[PDB]
Amino acid sequence: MVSFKAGINLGGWISQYQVFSKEHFDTFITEKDIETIAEAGFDHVRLPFDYPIIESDDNVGEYKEDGLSYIDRCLEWCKKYNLGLVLDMHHAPGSTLFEDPNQQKRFVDIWRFLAKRYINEREHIAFELLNQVVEPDSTRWNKLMLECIKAIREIDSTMWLYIGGNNYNSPDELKNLADIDDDYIVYNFHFYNPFFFTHQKAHWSESAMAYNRTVKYPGQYEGIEEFVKNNPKYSFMMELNNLKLNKELLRKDLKPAIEFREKKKCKLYCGEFGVIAIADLESRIKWHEDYISLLEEYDIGGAVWNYKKMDFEIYNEDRKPVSQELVNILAR
Numbered sequence: 001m002v003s004f005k006a007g008i009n010l011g012g013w014i015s016q017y018q019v020f021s022k023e024h025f026d027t028f029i030t031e032k033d034i035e036t037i038a039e040a041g042f043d044h045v046r047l048p049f050d051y052p053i054i055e056s057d058d059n060v061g062e063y064k065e066d067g068l069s070y071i072d073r074c075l076e077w078c079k080k081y082n083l084g085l086v087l088d089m090h091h092a093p094g095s096t097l098f099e100d101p102n103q104q105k106r107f108v109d110i111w112r113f114l115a116k117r118y119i120n121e122r123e124h125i126a127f128e129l130l131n132q133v134v135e136p137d138s139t140r141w142n143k144l145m146l147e148c149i150k151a152i153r154e155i156d157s158t159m160w161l162y163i164g165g166n167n168y169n170s171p172d173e174l175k176n177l178a179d180i181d182d183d184y185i186v187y188n189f190h191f192y193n194p195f196f197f198t199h200q201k202a203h204w205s206e207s208a209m210a211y212n213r214t215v216k217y218p219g220q221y222e223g224i225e226e227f228v229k230n231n232p233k234y235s236f237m238m239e240l241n242n243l244k245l246n247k248e249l250l251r252k253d254l255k256p257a258i259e260f261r262e263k264k265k266c267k268l269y270c271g272e273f274g275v276i277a278i279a280d281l282e283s284r285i286k287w288h289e290d291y292i293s294l295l296e297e298y299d300i301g302g303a304v305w306n307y308k309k310m311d312f313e314i315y316n317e318d319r320k321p322v323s324q325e326l327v328n329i330l331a332r
Contacts, residue, residue, distance in 0.1 A: 002084040002123045004186075006332040007044040007303035008037060009272060012310045014070050015048035015090040025053075025070055029307075034077035036319045037307070041331030044084030046271055046303040047074060048131065050091035051110065057093075060106055063113060079124050086162060086303070087114065088128035088271070095132070098140040107144070108151050115155040127152070128162035128188060128271065131169065138166045142178040149180060157184075162269060164188035169271070172256035187266050191273040191291070193253040194245050196221060198275045198287070202311070207234055217275075217283040218246045247290045254294055270295060270302035274312045281323065289329050296332065304330050 013029045037045060053067035071087065078085045089110075094103030111129065118125055129148060133141050145163060152159060163185055165173030171189040192198040195208075197215045202208045211227055211234070224241040228234060243249075261268050273291060275284045288304070295302055306312040313322060314330065321327040 002082060003043040003301075004084045004086065004126065004269070005044075005301035006042050006330065007046055007084070007086070007301070008042050008307050008314060008330070009046045009048065009303050009305045010074075011048050011306045012308070013047070014053045014067070015050045015088075016310065017050075020052065022066075029074070031077045031080075032319065033307070034074070034081055034083065036315070038081035038083055040321070040327050042083070044086060044303070045074075045078065045307075046086040046088055046128070047071070048088045048090040051089065051093055051106075052091075055093070055106065055110060061109065063110075068117070075118070075121065075125060079121075084124055084126065086126045086128050086271070088131060088162070090131045092130050092132065095134075098135065098144065104144055104147075108148050111148055112151050112155060115152045115159060119156060122158075126160040126162060126186070128164075131164070133164065133166050134168060135166050138173065138176040138178075141166055142176075146178055146180070149182065149185075153182070160184050160186060162186045162188045162271065164190075164271070171254065171260075174257060174260040185266065186269045187257075187260070187264075188269050188271045189257050191254070191270050193250060194221075194240075194243065196240070197245055197279070197283075200276060200279060202276055207237070210234060211237070214280070215245070215283075216280060217287045218244075219283070220244050247294075250291055251294060254298070257300075258298060268298075268300045270300055272305045273302060274305040274314075276311055277313050277322065278311070285323060285326050285329070288326060292329050292332065 010029055014025060017024055054063055075085055093106040094100055097103045097107065129145065135141055149161060152161065161184060165177050167173045169188050169190045174187050174189060196211060197217050199205050199208050200215045201212060210231055213223065215221060221240050221243045224237055228238050257268055275287050304314060308315050308317065314327065315321055
């Protein structure tokens with residue numbers, strides 16, 4: 001039996017790669033990595049991929065077997081170590097996806113193709129449709145998601161599909177998803193609360209970079225009022241002034257997902273959650289311990305971000321954990 005409860009992400013491999021290089025692709029993740037993950041106790045891996053490894057915008061419809069090989073081999077390694085694999089589309093075609101039906105067509109076609117390609121794999125693979133959803137409302141995503149589900153179901157009636165909502169799969173956007181009468185659906189949400197703690201000093205976040213402050217957990221945001229005074233552009237941060245960071249805050253942020261499930265009686269999954277590696281170790285470990293305990297209390301499976309690199313590393317390049325206590329907590 002394969003399970004999808006205590007996983008880890010393989011971001012930075014065939015998704016969010018620096019340069020499109022075969023050297024990177026052949027070496028970033030190898031069988032030794034899957035072996036390490038399996039020996040640690042995780043039951044599955046989440047594999048983000050960006051469309052270009054599979055389809056070029058030029059010869060649309062012509063799928064690259066060379067890119068597909070990275071996915072095929074990962075499936076092999078997973079089957080070998082009895083791990084599940086959640087195949088996740090990070091960057092879809094198009095942002096114009098919800099504007100251009102051609103982009104919509106390619107998106108659906110790519111999933112139709114993958115459903116066919118992996119039709120004989122019944123227990124080690126699951127599909128997670130799309131990660132990047134940031135829209136004014138869910139109307140357009142709901143339309144595309146339904147077509148995609150439909151297209152896939154004509155080919156595979158029992159393939160498990162992972163579906164997330166708007167606002168980067170926010171837990172409070174699940175309620176805005178169209179009702180899918182389907183029993184093989186798992187609802188996904190990401191969780192990085194409190195943001196200025198999990199992304200403190202994240203170089204890719206303008207506000208976090210402007211704030212440029214170390215934060216501990218449990219603890220409290222400090223100097224917000226002083227920061228806003230100097231930077232009126234970030235006035236909205238005044239809402240966070242002196243916010244107390246503790247386990248009850250995390251429980252409150254998780255509430256919307258729990259309420260949705262209480263109504264839908266569905267399965268929930270947290271595909272991404274984590275803390276930036278530069279945070280102090282003690283706080284980093286404590287946040288995971290508290291969050292994992294909430295996931296276990298509510299029986300919600302998930303995958304921590306990230307296996308290696310991507311600034312959220314759980315393992316060094318030497319395939320050794322940054323902290324053994326941390327890995328133990330995450331493997332449940």
